[PDB]
Amino acid sequence: EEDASQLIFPKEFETAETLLNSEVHMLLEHRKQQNESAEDEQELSEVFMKTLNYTARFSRFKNRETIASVRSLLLQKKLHKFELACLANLCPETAEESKALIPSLEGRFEDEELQQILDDIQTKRS
Amino acid sequence: MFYHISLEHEILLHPRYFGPNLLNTVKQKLFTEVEGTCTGKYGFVIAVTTIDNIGAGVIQPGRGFVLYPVKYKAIVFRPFKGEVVDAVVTQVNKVGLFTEIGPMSCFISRHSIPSEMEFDPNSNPPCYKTMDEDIVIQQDDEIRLKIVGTRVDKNDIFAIGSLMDDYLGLV
Amino acid sequence: LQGKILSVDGNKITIMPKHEDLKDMLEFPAQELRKYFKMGDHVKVIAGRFEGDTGLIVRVEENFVILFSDLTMHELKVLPRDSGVDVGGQHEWGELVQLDPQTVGVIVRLERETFQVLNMYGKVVTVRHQAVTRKKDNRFAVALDSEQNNIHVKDIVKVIDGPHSGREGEIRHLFRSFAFLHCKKLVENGGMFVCKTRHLVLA
Amino acid sequence: VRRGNSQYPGAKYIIRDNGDRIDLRFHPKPSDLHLQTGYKVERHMCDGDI
Amino acid sequence: GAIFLEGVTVKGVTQVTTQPKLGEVQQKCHQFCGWEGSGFPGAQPVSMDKQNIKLLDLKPYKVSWKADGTRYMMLIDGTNEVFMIDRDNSVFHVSNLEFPFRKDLRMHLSNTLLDGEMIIDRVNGQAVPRYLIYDIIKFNSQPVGDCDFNVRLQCIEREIISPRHEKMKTGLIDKTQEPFSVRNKPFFDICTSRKLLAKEVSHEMDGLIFQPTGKYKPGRCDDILKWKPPSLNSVDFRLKITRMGGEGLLPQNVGLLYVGGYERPFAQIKVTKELKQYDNKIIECKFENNSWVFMRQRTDKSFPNAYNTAMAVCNSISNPVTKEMLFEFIDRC
RNA sequence: ACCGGAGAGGGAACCCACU
After folding, report:
1. In this UniProt entry, which cysteines form S-S bonds (chain D)?
2. Nearest nucleotide (C1') to alpha carbon of C146
3. Same domain, B3 and B73
4. B154, C186 in Cβ contact below 8 A?
5. CB under 8 Å, gap of 24 or more: what pairs does A120-124 form?
6. Do chain D and chain E touch with ≥3 beta carbon pairs under 8 Å?
7. Which residue of B has its CA nearest to E251?
8. How many separate domains does chain B show?
9. E299 and chain C in contact, CB less than 8 A
10. What are the residues whose beta carbons fall under 8 Å from the beta carbon of B101, sequence distance 6 or more?
11. Which of B47, B166, B135 is nearest to A55 (CA)?
12. Contact between residue E221 and residue E241 where contact means Cβ atoms under 8 Å apart
């Protein structure tokens, strides 16, 4: 029953806030700086290292204020909360690509508005 | 997909950790227990950003241990049947291609691989390539992927992916 | 119509399915039904050469269903109610082969021109189908385990030393100081692995 | 523990953190006679016990 | 199994599996040693401890020095009959080694039994197998093992080495054709060992052996003492690197030093990632301080050594028996 | 490691007796 296309999510998992690769990197780098200082702490996990280097290589824009800007501008337009982060991670270059990647947006908004949002996304790309 | 959720857990403390710093030891115990852990229901718990609340700890009757109900914000990774995320190749093999996603590792099978991606054993690095020789899928490449199915192994999540879908390939 | 089984009888099952979008229960005889499954659900192999193995079905064909095992990603094709032999029909997966005059192994993967063979030293080698000879298996072999128990083909043993220490397996073949074992939980090499008999104990 | 079970003011078992139970009355090997702060020892009843 | 000398292959040395022959060669060794049980008849030295070093003062002792070598008794039975016996009772047949009789150089030695180590020795950058003759049990059936260790060392020189150098000077023995060099382990008295420990040999010594002057005896000899630095010093530990965090306790990873036949952790080690490579592998450890620390990993061995072995080595390392500690103890006698 | 110290040793019924 759990399908990303039809937007079924667990009730316990419904209210969670979804995240971007770049902001996940800034959080993980904050944790890394926290652990490297204040010694006599456990060594970070292989999972932590893999996620850190993954989101480093997959970081779209490094700027912190850009994260807040893109989040706010995209949420201002009425869209489902799960779609914000997946769209910003994938960064489609055409609205046809965006609808192919996420079928939910197909028919949700017109081609011109979808392409304008995508163009803003690439505009804030670093 | 990456998320920010609040979770509930209870940690037992041995009486020797009471000390003058009990809450710090509580924080350390929770970190060491739920850092890098995996649950089939909620997926990978990558890191704990903050601890929302640490409740009143109850002394177990007949046991010196004390359990604290703890509220904490953690970032989780649990993939979907139907989500699309970019992945990175780790190994080229004749059974299939090994690619790495975050903490989790998934493989694409040959029958799920489109028939255009022919095998190249004889290339010095084993490769997935077309007859037109345009698309070169090789070790350490970053690719699009469609994860269809997930499995839990020793409370750790592994998944499987599909690549038949359009536009889904090399970045 | 597809739906889930409420109850069951032995012949006319009077399977009372709850079909998708149907709140009513119908009745079907067994002969009218088959076990369907969309791709991506977990399946178990109920009976066959593969029975006990599990996997996610990637593709469904007419009556054919293909899937990847959870232990190993080695492919599987089975019937909807539920080959195992290479092209050429001479050899089949899991068989004992002679690699050269001194070395034996077990075939653990079938390819169009080659096999992957787990040799008696624990290494996997690639060989052309004709470069190995089919070896007569000694189903009545006996050896000693680490506690001097007699062990035989089909016995369940625990590994208590060596690389696979902590594992558990079924003895599939025995040769001199070597044992080829199978454990379905091991996805590597289709579940096959090799241990010294003195590193084993009868479970 | 060194006195052991034979002498009366002694112990019968010594329980370690893993839960391993060592029996003191049947030739305990001098290695596991050694004990750390986490362990429990099953001494005999003594004067002042309630 | 049977690997004659590991690290170098030796031409003409051939293990023997054929029961008619093998069975005898093993037996003629028990015979010559006056040996009781099954297995290896040869003298087994004991590790020097704070009790042991005392004997150095209770009678005369000669000292030589332990090289890492493989223990072999060489049985010289005839013209092509030459065999090696190891700690295991495994038997090898050595092919082009020839032993002339001091009297008739055309005659070959028979019913002779020697004790010694087989040692790879690199000179001129190259690995030369040597057999060091460290004792002789039997010579032409003559019960020389009953003689004085000084008599026996002299026997070896005159009855074994000297005849062969003689046949060598004449070309009738080609040092080049022979599977390995044959030599007598050199022995000196107690005082000279002191010099060994202004030591410029301070790297090259794996230890010392202290040999009493008494007649040869088989099996366990509490009066032959092997001394090895405790730093090097020294038991085979089966290690399970384990994340042992008790209930209510912060999870901790430790290395549990298991031994043979004792189901529990004998000791603990300061586990480290640079020690994580040899997970679940047999290792040697050094008990300099209260902490056992790792020198080398023994892939050849699969089982940890026994609990009684662990006890003996712990006692020995607790009472460190040094060269100066026993030098005076024998010099008093 | 040569065995691993293995001790767990039915039960129901009735009778007598103790405080």
Report:
1. none
2. F1
3. yes
4. no
5. A120/A70, A120/A73, A121/A70, A121/A74, A121/A87, A121/A88, A121/A91, A122/A91, A122/A93, A124/A61, A124/A66, A124/A69, A124/A70
6. yes
7. B32
8. 2
9. no
10. A54, B79, B85, B87, B88, B145, B147, B159
11. B47
12. no
Using the beta-carbon criterion (under 8 Å), do D29 and E307 form an inter-chain contact?
yes
Mutation site for E-interface testing, chosen from D21, D29, D33, D34 by largest number of E Cβ within 10 Å? D29
Experimental resolution (Å): 3.6
Q: Which amino acid is at A44?
A: L
- The residue lying closest to nucleotide F3, measuring its CA against C1', is C147
Mark whether B1 and B69 lie in a shared domain.
yes
CA dist B138 and B145 (Å) reads 15
Q: Are residues B44 and B97 in the same domain?
A: no
D26 touches strand F (CB under 7 A): yes
Distance D24 CA to F7 C1' (A): 15
Burial class of residue B165 (count of CB atoms within 10 Å of its CB; 0-12, 13-18, 19+): middle
Contact of B151 with chain C, judged by CB distance below 8 Å, is answered with: yes
Q: Report yes or no: E79 and E89 within 8 Å, Cβ to Cβ.
A: no
- Statement: the CB of E304 is under 7 Å from strand F: no
- Boundary (domain end) residue, out of B46, B80, B114: B80
* E7 in B contact zone (CB under 8 Å): no
Going by their DSSP bridges, the two strands E44-47 and E220-227 should be labelled as parallel
On whether the CB atoms of residues E100 and E166 are closer than 8 A, the answer is yes
**Is B5 in the same domain as B53?**
yes
Q: What is the Cα–Cα distance from C111 to C74, expressed in whole angstroms?
A: 11
What 3-state class would DSSP assign to E142? strand
Contacts of B5 in chain A (CB under 8 A): 13, 16-17
- B102 and B67 within one domain: no
Using a 10 angstrom Cβ sphere, with 0-12 exposed, 13-18 middle and 19 or more buried, the burial of residue B41 is exposed
Residue where a domain terminates, one of B62, B80, B98:
B80
- Give A91→chain B minimum CA distance, Å: 11
Q: Which residues pair with B91 in a beta bridge?
A: B98
Neighbours of A61 (CB within 10 A): 19
Q: Under a CB-based contact definition with an 8 Å cutoff, are residues E87 and E24 in contact?
A: no
Nearest residue of E to residue B25, measured between CA atoms = E250
Q: Which residues of chain B are within 8 Å of residue A27 when distances are taken between CB atoms?
A: 47, 49, 75
Q: Which residue of E has its CA nearest to B67?
A: E248
> How is residue B29 annotated by DSSP?
H
User: Which experiment gave this structure?
Assistant: cryo-EM
Segments forming the whole domain that contains residue B2:
1-80
What's the rounded Cα separation, in Å, for the pair E89 and E292?
A: 33
C104: Cα separation from own chain's centroid: 20
Question: Quick one: CA dihedral B162, B163, B165, B171, positive or negative?
Answer: positive
Q: Look-up: residue for tokens 């009472």? A: E319
